[PDB]
Paper text:
As part of this study, the structure of ypTpxC61S was solved to a resolution of 2.55 Å in space group P64. This structure represents the “forced” reduced form of the protein, as the resolving cysteine has been mutated to a serine, rendering it catalytically inactive. The C61S mutant Tpx is present only in its reduced form and cannot undergo the intramolecular disulphide bond formation critical for the catalytic cycle of the protein. All of our solution data indicate that the mutant structure and the reduced wild type structure are identical, and that the oligomeric states are the same. When superimposed onto the reduced structure, the r.m.s.d. was 0.52 Å over 163 Cα. This fits well with the structural analysis of Hall et al. who used the TpxC61S mutant from E. coli to describe the structure of reduced Tpx. The dimer interfaces are identical in the structures of reduced Tpx and C61S. For ypTpx C61S is 2.80 S, suggesting that this mutation does not induce structural instability (i.e. the value is comparable with those determined for reduced and oxidised ypTpx). In comparison, the purified C61S mutant was present only as a monomer of 21 kDa. This difference can be attributed to the changes in the strength of the dimer interface, arising from the loss of two salt bridges in the ‘forced’ reduced C61S mutant, which in turn is more susceptible to the heat and detergent experienced during the far-western blotting procedure.
Author numbering:
A (entry chain A), B (entry chain A): 0 to 164
Write the structure that this text describes.
Amino acid sequence: TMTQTVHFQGNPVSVAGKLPQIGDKAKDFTLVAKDLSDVALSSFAGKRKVLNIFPSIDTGVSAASVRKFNQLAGELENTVVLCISSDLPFAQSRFCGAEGLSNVITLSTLRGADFKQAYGVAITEGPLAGLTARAVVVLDGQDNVIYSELVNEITTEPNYDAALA
Amino acid sequence: TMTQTVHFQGNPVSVAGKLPQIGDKAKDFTLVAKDLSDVALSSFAGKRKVLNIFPSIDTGVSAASVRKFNQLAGELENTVVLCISSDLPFAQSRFCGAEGLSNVITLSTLRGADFKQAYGVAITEGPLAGLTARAVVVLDGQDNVIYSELVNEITTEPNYDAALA
């Protein structure tokens, strides 16, 4: 079993598996949409993917990342932004409905919990155990990894400008 | 494996296990609190428990039940109301913080997913799969079941007045 290390403020927390690095082929996942429908990664074939992985959408830092990726989604070409978290579809829907975000597509780990182990983002120990770590993974049309970032510390935002290819 | 049957509007959905009926001894569970601390059922020993189990706190019907149980919690004697759902602690905290509910204690199935199987409330199939069914379980000081209700249909509220002993 592979082990990664991130932190909250300054507290080492173990992450199961490893984030798919450059050149690797990302595993096909199936997650719950806003209308409780199972949406797979294979449905976005031919289109570029930006996977925004965060602990919870109700937290302060992660709420800013969804709003940021929503605004730059209109600037992107042939790209769909997929906000993935441990939140339920209802918690993700009430946020996007109140903030007026329509460009992003929310995905829930309610069904498809194996996503955490396949992408190496599952938090093993601590108070954040069971949640997903802060990560940004950029994919092409054929699910090949072009960009992948595992943010060393949870409180700081991932790099949005470097995610561009 | 035992199988129970409830529905959404009029669509039969299978529930794994069975709700602990009258006379049975309820299993000890450990769930996540609002401050990300693991709180067990053994911590409320000597006190009477009212377990409010619902799919999601962001849904319309379940939001009314939490508000109802919060108002009658001040009327109850030696009783703690535990709102249990598949929601994250952050989604439960933002609701109670905005509505001004303080009498209820929110518990998350983020850690302690075995609660669903032990109490027989896990939804097996359909769009609501992975979530908890609508149930109200009343316990005494020694975790013995005094009242238990599995609401036949999700959209209708559980009986609050009959839950009193």
